[PDB]
Design a protein around this motif. Structure first.
Motif, PDB file in Angstrom:
ATOM      1  N   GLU A   1       0.853  -1.213   0.000  1.00 20.60           N
ATOM      2  CA  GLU A   1       0.000   0.000   0.000  1.00 20.60           C
ATOM      3  C   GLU A   1       0.893   1.271   0.000  1.00 20.60           C
ATOM      4  O   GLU A   1       1.903   1.348   0.708  1.00 20.60           O
ATOM      5  N   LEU A   2       0.470   2.276  -0.783  1.00 17.28           N
ATOM      6  CA  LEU A   2       1.146   3.595  -0.880  1.00 17.28           C
ATOM      7  C   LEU A   2       0.839   4.448   0.406  1.00 17.28           C
ATOM      8  O   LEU A   2      -0.334   4.791   0.595  1.00 17.28           O
ATOM      9  N   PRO A   3       1.809   4.808   1.303  1.00 15.97           N
ATOM     10  CA  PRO A   3       1.507   5.508   2.586  1.00 15.97           C
ATOM     11  C   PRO A   3       1.196   7.034   2.437  1.00 15.97           C
ATOM     12  O   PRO A   3       0.983   7.543   1.331  1.00 15.97           O
ATOM     13  N   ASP A   4       1.134   7.750   3.576  1.00 14.86           N
ATOM     14  CA  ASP A   4       0.708   9.179   3.640  1.00 14.86           C
ATOM     15  C   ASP A   4       1.540  10.166   2.762  1.00 14.86           C
ATOM     16  O   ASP A   4       0.946  10.902   1.968  1.00 14.86           O
ATOM     17  N   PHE A   5       2.881  10.198   2.921  1.00 13.74           N
ATOM     18  CA  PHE A   5       3.775  11.227   2.307  1.00 13.74           C
ATOM     19  C   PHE A   5       3.411  12.705   2.661  1.00 13.74           C
ATOM     20  O   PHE A   5       3.265  13.564   1.785  1.00 13.74           O
ATOM     21  N   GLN A   6       3.290  12.975   3.973  1.00 10.09           N
ATOM     22  CA  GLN A   6       2.934  14.304   4.524  1.00 10.09           C
ATOM     23  C   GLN A   6       4.036  14.787   5.516  1.00 10.09           C
ATOM     24  O   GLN A   6       5.072  14.134   5.680  1.00 10.09           O
TER      25      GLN A   6
ATOM     26  N   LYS B   1      12.106   1.236   1.954  1.00  9.39           N
ATOM     27  CA  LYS B   1      11.164   1.370   3.102  1.00  9.39           C
ATOM     28  C   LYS B   1      10.709   2.853   3.216  1.00  9.39           C
ATOM     29  O   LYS B   1      11.398   3.789   2.799  1.00  9.39           O
ATOM     30  N   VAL B   2       9.530   3.061   3.825  1.00 10.76           N
ATOM     31  CA  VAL B   2       8.971   4.412   4.089  1.00 10.76           C
ATOM     32  C   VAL B   2       8.011   4.289   5.315  1.00 10.76           C
ATOM     33  O   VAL B   2       7.098   3.454   5.334  1.00 10.76           O
ATOM     34  N   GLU B   3       8.238   5.158   6.320  1.00 12.90           N
ATOM     35  CA  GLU B   3       7.492   5.155   7.607  1.00 12.90           C
ATOM     36  C   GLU B   3       6.830   6.534   7.858  1.00 12.90           C
ATOM     37  O   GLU B   3       7.376   7.592   7.542  1.00 12.90           O
ATOM     38  N   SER B   4       5.642   6.485   8.471  1.00 12.17           N
ATOM     39  CA  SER B   4       4.769   7.677   8.691  1.00 12.17           C
ATOM     40  C   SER B   4       4.971   8.349  10.099  1.00 12.17           C
ATOM     41  O   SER B   4       5.543   7.700  10.982  1.00 12.17           O
TER      42      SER B   4
ATOM     43  N   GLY C   1       6.542  15.235   7.997  1.00  7.28           N
ATOM     44  CA  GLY C   1       7.106  14.290   8.982  1.00  7.28           C
ATOM     45  C   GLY C   1       7.059  12.798   8.572  1.00  7.28           C
ATOM     46  O   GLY C   1       6.850  11.967   9.454  1.00  7.28           O
ATOM     47  N   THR C   2       7.293  12.430   7.292  1.00  4.97           N
ATOM     48  CA  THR C   2       7.361  11.015   6.850  1.00  4.97           C
ATOM     49  C   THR C   2       8.857  10.733   6.533  1.00  4.97           C
ATOM     50  O   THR C   2       9.498  11.439   5.750  1.00  4.97           O
ATOM     51  N   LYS C   3       9.391   9.654   7.120  1.00  7.14           N
ATOM     52  CA  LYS C   3      10.755   9.160   6.815  1.00  7.14           C
ATOM     53  C   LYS C   3      10.717   8.202   5.594  1.00  7.14           C
ATOM     54  O   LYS C   3      10.483   7.002   5.745  1.00  7.14           O
TER      55      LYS C   3
ATOM     56  N   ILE D   1      10.127  14.176   4.709  1.00 10.69           N
ATOM     57  CA  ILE D   1       9.053  14.927   3.992  1.00 10.69           C
ATOM     58  C   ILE D   1       8.726  16.224   4.798  1.00 10.69           C
ATOM     59  O   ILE D   1       8.127  16.140   5.866  1.00 10.69           O
ATOM     60  N   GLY D   2       9.102  17.403   4.280  1.00 11.18           N
ATOM     61  CA  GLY D   2       8.539  18.705   4.727  1.00 11.18           C
ATOM     62  C   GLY D   2       8.622  19.112   6.216  1.00 11.18           C
ATOM     63  O   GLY D   2       7.636  19.622   6.754  1.00 11.18           O
TER      64      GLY D   2
END
Length: 165
Positions: free
Chosen positions: A23-28, A155-158, A30-32, A63-64
């Motif tokens: 699944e494609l996560p948030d990307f807002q 990897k990508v974490e929210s 504070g995302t690592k 992210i931002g």
């Protein structure tokens, strides 16, 4: 909603090589997002200025919140855990890429310049004078060019699950 449909109207133009997994996560804010990067010239020379998967050492983009260069975040907002995409971005977005290249190396030692002025993460036993002053990314400072960013997502974490030790 539809991120491929907003990237084509942003000035940039994207292409995925291998569509990954999950699944494609948030990307807002504070995302690592942890991934590899390979920046090379599009049609002026074809020369590779930077290459991270060539030695096997992956980068980290916030992210931002911490990170200065916003075109890396709009590149990886379409990308999921294990997806590989290579594509050009217009010079209006990569204008401050040769300025943030002097901080994604240097400030990435361990949070802020004076705050962590210390090698306590994974740099031990290396006698080398570094000396800052590039010619590969300083070619843009004399003549700016729209570059090929080959990113490889792993990897990508929210905001909630990610933490530094």
């Amino acid at each position: 909603a539809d991120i491929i449909a907003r990237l084509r109207e942003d000035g940039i133009q994207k292409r995925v090589i291998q569509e990954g997994r999950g699944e494609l996560p948030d990307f807002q804010d504070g995302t690592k997002a942890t991934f590899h990067y390979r920046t090379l010239h599009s049609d002026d020379e074809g020369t590779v200025l930077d290459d991270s998967r060539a030695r096997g050492k992956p980068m980290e983009l916030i992210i931002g919140k911490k990170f200065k260069l916003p075109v890396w975040e709009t590149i990886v907002c379409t990308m999921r855990e294990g997806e590989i995409a290579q594509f050009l971005c217009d010079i209006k977005h990569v204008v401050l890429y040769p300025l943030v290249a002097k901080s994604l190396r240097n400030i990435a030692v361990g949070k802020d310049p004076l705050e962590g002025q210390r090698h306590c993460c994974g740099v031990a036993q290396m006698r080398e004078h570094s000396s800052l002053g590039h010619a590969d990314l300083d070619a843009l400072q004399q003549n700016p060019q729209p570059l090929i960013f080959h990113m490889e997502m792993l990897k990508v974490e929210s905001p909630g699950t990610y933490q530094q030790d």
